[PDB]
Amino acid sequence: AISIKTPEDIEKMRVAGRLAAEVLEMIEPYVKPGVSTGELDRICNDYIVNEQHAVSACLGYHGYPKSVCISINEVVCHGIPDDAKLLKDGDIVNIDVTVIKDGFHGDTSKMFIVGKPTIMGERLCRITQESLYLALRMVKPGINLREIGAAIQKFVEAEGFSVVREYCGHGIGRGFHEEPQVLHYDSRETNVVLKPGMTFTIEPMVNAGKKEIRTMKDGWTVKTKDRSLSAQYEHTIVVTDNGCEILTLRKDDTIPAIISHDE
Ligand SMILES: N=C1N=NC(N)=C1/N=N/c1cccc(C(=O)O)c1
Ligand SMILES: [Co+2]
Ligand SMILES: [Co+2]
Ligand code: NA
């Protein structure tokens, strides 16, 4: 039961996706040693509401208390912005932005490396982004999502890293999470043949160590069981007649927005 967006809906998703990307471009100069994640979230929320005239989709969702998710180092996902949590040299930090504009969602995330990188953090982030990019290059009508998940997993595991099983990409539109699920690993349960006009995210979570995760007592924060680093990147796309179009591209992305597989 996957919805096919009309041309007009796709345009609304271009607008919302651009906004989500622009939050990430806006926040970059503030992501520096010494800043708190609480401050970063306030800057993002003020921007979303006062400048973009949009709404955070995370705020209040299942009771989530903040406007963007900010996850550092061994935190896998859903980290909660906190005025007492300060960024420091060598940290890897995901900021995940999901906004609603004119009824439609845009959803994206990226890693930031704070100050002087660690080589392992830089490698983990790079491989994670590359795994997203290889998946994006596969998207076209007639391909199965299973093939995409399997390919992400093979690539990541060859680097000695692992793919988190509990979270996945998703259909997106008027709802935050819509059909289909987009698993970043191979499953016999996956059988989804892509069609033009489907809109969904790809967003692998990749651990440097083992795949297993743990949720903290705060009921939100997810960490690697082994306290290894974890990284994630996310884009929202639309399937096109000949490939896909990335709706959340930033200037710092190094893949084209429009990917075509025709001659
Ligand atoms: N921020 C997101 N981007 N893609 C997703 N699937 C994201 N999920 N975010 C949240 C945010 C708050 C709560 C939850 C939840 O599952 O309870 C999930
Ligand atoms: Co997201
Ligand atoms: Co998402
Ligand atoms: Na992390």
mmCIF file of N, CA, C and O and ligand atoms in Angstrom, residues 96-98 107-109 170 176 203 234, ligand 2:
data_model
loop_
_atom_site.group_PDB
_atom_site.id
_atom_site.type_symbol
_atom_site.label_atom_id
_atom_site.label_comp_id
_atom_site.label_asym_id
_atom_site.label_seq_id
_atom_site.Cartn_x
_atom_site.Cartn_y
_atom_site.Cartn_z
ATOM 1 N N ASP A 96 19.713 15.015 12.930
ATOM 2 C CA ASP A 96 18.617 14.500 12.114
ATOM 3 C C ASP A 96 17.477 15.508 12.179
ATOM 4 O O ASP A 96 16.960 15.806 13.254
ATOM 5 N N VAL A 97 17.150 16.045 11.001
ATOM 6 C CA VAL A 97 16.145 17.075 10.806
ATOM 7 C C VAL A 97 14.970 16.500 10.019
ATOM 8 O O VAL A 97 15.115 15.989 8.909
ATOM 9 N N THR A 98 13.780 16.652 10.592
ATOM 10 C CA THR A 98 12.556 16.277 9.913
ATOM 11 C C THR A 98 11.583 17.423 10.085
ATOM 12 O O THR A 98 11.206 17.749 11.206
ATOM 13 N N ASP A 107 13.105 14.849 5.325
ATOM 14 C CA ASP A 107 13.804 14.108 6.374
ATOM 15 C C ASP A 107 15.228 13.834 5.932
ATOM 16 O O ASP A 107 15.466 13.223 4.886
ATOM 17 N N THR A 108 16.184 14.318 6.716
ATOM 18 C CA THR A 108 17.581 14.146 6.356
ATOM 19 C C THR A 108 18.454 14.218 7.588
ATOM 20 O O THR A 108 18.079 14.766 8.617
ATOM 21 N N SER A 109 19.645 13.647 7.487
ATOM 22 C CA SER A 109 20.607 13.692 8.579
ATOM 23 C C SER A 109 21.998 13.608 7.994
ATOM 24 O O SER A 109 22.205 13.065 6.895
ATOM 25 N N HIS A 170 12.203 4.656 5.369
ATOM 26 C CA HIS A 170 10.739 4.643 5.378
ATOM 27 C C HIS A 170 10.189 5.485 4.246
ATOM 28 O O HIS A 170 10.727 6.512 3.877
ATOM 29 N N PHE A 176 5.085 10.975 8.498
ATOM 30 C CA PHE A 176 6.527 10.897 8.768
ATOM 31 C C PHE A 176 7.031 9.529 8.299
ATOM 32 O O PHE A 176 7.964 9.441 7.496
ATOM 33 N N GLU A 203 18.705 5.511 5.061
ATOM 34 C CA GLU A 203 19.349 6.071 6.242
ATOM 35 C C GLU A 203 20.053 5.032 7.116
ATOM 36 O O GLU A 203 19.733 4.829 8.283
ATOM 37 N N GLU A 234 21.284 10.258 6.013
ATOM 38 C CA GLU A 234 19.928 10.062 5.503
ATOM 39 C C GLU A 234 19.597 11.064 4.410
ATOM 40 O O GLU A 234 19.903 12.247 4.522
HETATM 41 CO CO CO B 2 15.611 11.630 9.813
#
